Amino acid sequence: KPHISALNAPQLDQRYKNEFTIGAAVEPYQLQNEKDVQMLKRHFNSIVAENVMKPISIQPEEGKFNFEQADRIVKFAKANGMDIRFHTLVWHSQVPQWFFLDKEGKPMVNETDPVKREQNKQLLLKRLETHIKTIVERYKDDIKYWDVVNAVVGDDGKLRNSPWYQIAGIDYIKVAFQAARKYGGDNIKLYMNDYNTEVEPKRTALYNLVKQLKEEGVPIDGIGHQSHIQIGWPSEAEIEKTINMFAALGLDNQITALDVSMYGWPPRAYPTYDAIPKQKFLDQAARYDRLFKLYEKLSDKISNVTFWGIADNHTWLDSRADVYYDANGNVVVDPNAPYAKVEKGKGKDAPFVFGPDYKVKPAYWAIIDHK
C-alpha cells in the first residue's frame, strides 16, 4: 500500500458511487491550482464552499451581493458533473452585523420596549427573507443541497442564543426554511446542519427541534452532521445511533464537513507535519476504516459524505492546532503534562486521506478497499 500520488490512484468517488457522493470543501483560489483541480476531477463528485457562500461573503452590506466567488465554484461544479451544497443561508458566526441593527442603527438585541422588539423581529425576518430569496432565485437550478441553517442548537441542549434567536425567537428557523422552499421549489433539498450532533444533550435537543418543526409543516429534508471528529471520539456506536434516529424521522443524513483530527480537545498539536509520528497515521487509518465501513452499513440513510478540504496542506483545523511548549522549549502533546507557553493556531493537523504532497495516506487505503 504505497504512498503514491493521489492524482493517479483509484478514484474515491467511484469506490462509493452506489453508497453516497464524496465531496470536498474548497476556496475559489484552489480552482486555480493545477493539483487541486485534478484532485477534484479525479476523486470527488460533490463540492461545497469553505467560506464564500457564507452570509457575510454573499451580502456584506445590505443590498450589496457578491456572487462572483460563489459563481466560480458553481461553474466548476457544473462543468465537472458535481453536485453542489450551499453553505450556508443562516449562521451566528461572522454574520454581517447590519442584519441586527434597528432603524436607528442601534443593536436590536438591546431594545427593551416590547413593541419595538416586535418591530425589530419583523424587520429582521424581512431581511432574512430577502437574503434567502436573492440567493435561491439565482442558484435554484444549479444547487441541489442547502444548509438552510447552521449550528442553531447550543451545546447545552438549549437553542443557541445568537442574535437571530434573541431578536426573532424560533421563527427565524421556520422563516429560513419556508423562504428557501418558496423560491427554490420542491426539487432543492433543505438541511439543518450542526456539529457534535452525536453528543447529548445537543443531539436530543436537535432531534426534538426537527421533529417539532416537521410536525408543524416546516420543510426540512435532512440533517447535516459536520462530523469534526477525533481518532477515538465519538464512538462509531454513537454515530450510528445518531444517524439512525434522524433517519427514523424521515430525514436524509449528509456528513458535511468531515475531518479526523490527529488531536484531542483542546488540541496539543505538533508544530509541523514532519513531526507527527508515523503511528498516528496508522491509528487514523483504522478509525477511517471503521468509520467508512459504518457509513456503508448505513448507506441507505446517507446521501453524501463531504470532507472539509481536499488534502492535508490546507485545513481549517490548523487554526485550532495550538502548540504547547515546556520550559526547555520542547513541544508538549500529552494533555496532562507540564507546559510553559502555548502558540495558538500555529501547529499542523493532518485530517484527510490525502497528504500535503497530494500522495495517499494509510487512511486512503483503509477506505478504498473492500474489507
- Distance, in Å, from the CA atom of 290 to the CA atom of 296, rounded to the nearest integer, reads 10
Q: Are strands 189-194 and 21-26 parallel, antiparallel or unpaired?
A: unpaired
Rule CB under 5 A: say whether 61 interacts with Zn ion. Answer: no
Contact call for residue 233 and Cl ion (CB under 5 A): no
**Smallest gap from residue 316 Cβ to Cl ion (A):** 4
Cross-sheet strand order for the sheet of 323-325: 331-332, 323-325, 341-343
Rule CB under 5 A: is residue 23 a binding residue for Cl ion? no
Per-residue binder mask for Zn ion (CB under 5 A), 277-316, x = binder = ------------x---------x---x-------------
Calculate the alpha carbon distances from 98 to 87, 106, 112 in Å: 20, 10, 19
Cβ proximity to Cl ion: between 172 and 354 the closer is 354
Q: How far apart are CA 371 and CA 365, in angstroms?
A: 10
Q: What, of Cl ion, Zn ion, none, does residue 272 touch, CB below 5 to 8 Å by kind?
A: Zn ion
CA-based diameter of the chain, in Å? 67
Q: Report whether 89 contacts 53 (CB < 8 A).
A: no
Q: Which of residues 36-55 bind Zn ion (CB under 5 A)?
A: 45, 50
Residue 224 near Cl ion by CB under 5 A: no
Give residues 310-329 in contact with Cl ion (rule: CB under 5 A).
Answer: 316
CA dist., res. 28 & res. 85, Å (int) = 15
What is the contact mask toward Cl ion in residues 268 to 307, using x (rule: CB under 5 A)? ----------------------------------------
CA 51 – CA 87 distance, rounded (Å): 8
- Binding track over 85-124 against Zn ion, x by CB under 5 A: ----------------------------------------
Give the shortest CB-60-to-Zn ion separation in angstroms: 19
Of the residues 55, 222, 351, 355, which one makes contact with Cl ion according to CB under 5 A: 355
Stretch that binds Cl ion, among 87-95, 108-116, 132-140, 347-355 (CB under 5 A): 347-355
If one asks whether residue 253 binds Zn ion (CB under 5 A), the answer comes out as: no
Find cell 427541534 and name the residue: 209
Q: Which residues of 192-231 are buried (b: 16+ CB within 10 A; e: fewer)?
A: bbbbbbbbeebbebbbebbbebbeeebbbbbbbbbbbbbb
Subset of 2-41 contacting Zn ion (CB under 5 A): 13, 20
**Distance of alpha carbon 266 from alpha carbon 90, whole angstroms:** 27
Total chain residues near Zn ion (CB under 5 A):
15
The binding site for Cl ion (CB under 5 A) comprises: 316, 355, 357
Point out which residues bind Zn ion (CB under 5 A).
13, 20, 45, 50, 272-274, 289, 299, 303, 355, 357, 359, 366, 369
